[PDB]
């Protein structure tokens, strides 16, 4: 449930609570910025429908919305660059305090292209690898995406089992990012088509991308 929310400065942002809570009384909101300690910003009083702000914070900046029963959204007003980071909703017991999946908030005024969705490039196994090792490696390259928050995994065409893939780190390319993932499939499965599934905020229609890797087809050298 690791999402990103990219917004310009001076706008409002909505951050959704990922926890499934039964009989919540207080919903706590935490901010984690890279290199800093996670800290609570406020909590929401479920019974009185009130926000309790940490000392120093301006009223109106944060607001906990309840769109429906036992469902919470943190609304931030007047965004600044320093509002960026990972936001978590939290509660006590299932006593231990438990956290949601967390949302990466990205505040930027950067003038980017209309399409900052990950752009795919497919690589098919080399003839030397399939011949010698009775396995083929498929590589999926994703480029020119923003923000850096992305998830790539692999599946067979008519199967929902997650395959054993590997991945490189996300790398910055000018104002954008790139990432690649690869899958080694045995000879016996080389005749099957494979899917590289990419989850990203800026994908077309907010639905994850399904990149099809065609099956290896036999070729006679005449």
């Amino acid at each position: 449930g690791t999402k990103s929310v990219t917004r310009p400065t001076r706008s409002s942002a909505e951050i959704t609570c990922d926890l499934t809570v039964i009989n919540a009384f207080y919903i706590h909101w935490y901010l984690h910025q890279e290199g800093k300690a996670p800290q609570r910003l406020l909590y929401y009083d479920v019974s009185n429908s009130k926000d309790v702000l940490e000392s120093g914070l301006s009223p109106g900046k944060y607001y906990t919305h309840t769109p429906r029963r036992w469902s919470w959204i943190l609304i931030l007003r007047n965004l600044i660059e320093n509002d960026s980071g990972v936001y978590y909703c939290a509660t006590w017991d299932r006593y231990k305090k438990l956290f949601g999946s967390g949302t990466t908030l990205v505040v930027t005024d950067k003038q980017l292209d209309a399409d900052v969705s990950p752009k795919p490039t497919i690589f098919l196994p080399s003839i030397a690898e399939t011949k010698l090792q009775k396995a083929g490696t498929y590589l999926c390259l994703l480029e020119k995406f923003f923000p850096d928050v992305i998830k790539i995994h692999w599946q067979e065409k008519k199967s929902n089992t997650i395959l054993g893939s590997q991945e490189g780190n996300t790398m910055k390319t000018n104002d954008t990012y790139m990432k690649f993932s690869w899958l080694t499939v045995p000879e016996e499965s080389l005749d099957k088509e494979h899917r590289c599934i990419v989850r990203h905020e800026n994908n077309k229609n907010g639905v994850d991308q399904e990149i099809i890797f065609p099956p290896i087809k036999t070729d006679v050298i005449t």
Partner: protein, 202 residues
């Protein structure tokens, strides 16, 4: 109230053990300490809790060496597994246990689990292409130390290679670039005093 995690990073091999230190300052009489694991996907997972009036916490491969005098709550991760590689956070309850209470966190300590010591393994080397893009794939090598070279006389761009631990406990690597002369681009790898060419396999 303050929480300090002095170590920024720590490295230990698989099956071995690592200890993560934490020091705190609190005015509260009775309190609680918690240890969390933060995944690279940013998920915050509860591991273990230690009480002010309790003995030493133990929950599977996790244990807490508690010293209320010095105010020290070191976490030990025993019999290390590769998925133990994460960022570990120490949190102080304010005081903890009550529904309105906040946690005061430390800045966290990164743990990297190293593969075990093994016989040296020479890799196989392959090249995959898509137009201008050339990927060099380096399979099953040990040790980690390697120089991967894509042989081109017209390089557009080159990225840092990605080195990962393989399911057999060795290493795999991928080096990508963009080359004008992509159709003739070949790969050479320097590893364990040997030179492996992608053309060796062709």
């Amino acid at each position: 109230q303050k929480v300090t995690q002095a170590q920024s990073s720590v490295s230990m091999p698989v099956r071995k053990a690592v200890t993560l230190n934490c020091l705190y300052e609190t005015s509260w009489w009775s309190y609680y300490i918690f240890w969390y694991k933060q995944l690279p996907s940013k998920e915050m997972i509860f591991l273990i809790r230690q009480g002010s009036d309790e003995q030493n916490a133990k929950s599977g491969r996790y244990s807490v060496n508690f010293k209320k005098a010095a105010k020290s709550v070191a976490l030990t991760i025993s019999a290390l597994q590769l998925e133990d590689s994460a960022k570990y956070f120490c949190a102080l309850g304010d005081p903890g246990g009550l529904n309105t209470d906040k946690l005061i966190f430390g800045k966290g300590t990164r743990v990297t689990v190293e593969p075990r010591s093994q016989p040296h393994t020479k890799p196989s080397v392959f090249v995959m292409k898509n137009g201008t893009n050339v990927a060099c794939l380096v399979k099953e090598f040990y040790p980690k130390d390697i120089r991967i070279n894509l042989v081109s006389s017209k390089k557009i761009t080159e990225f840092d290679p990605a080195i990962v631990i393989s399911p057999s406990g060795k290493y795999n690597a991928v080096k990508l670039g963009k080359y004008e002369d992509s159709n003739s681009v070949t790969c050479s790898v320097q590893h364990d005093n040997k030179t492996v060419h992608s053309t060796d396999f062709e």
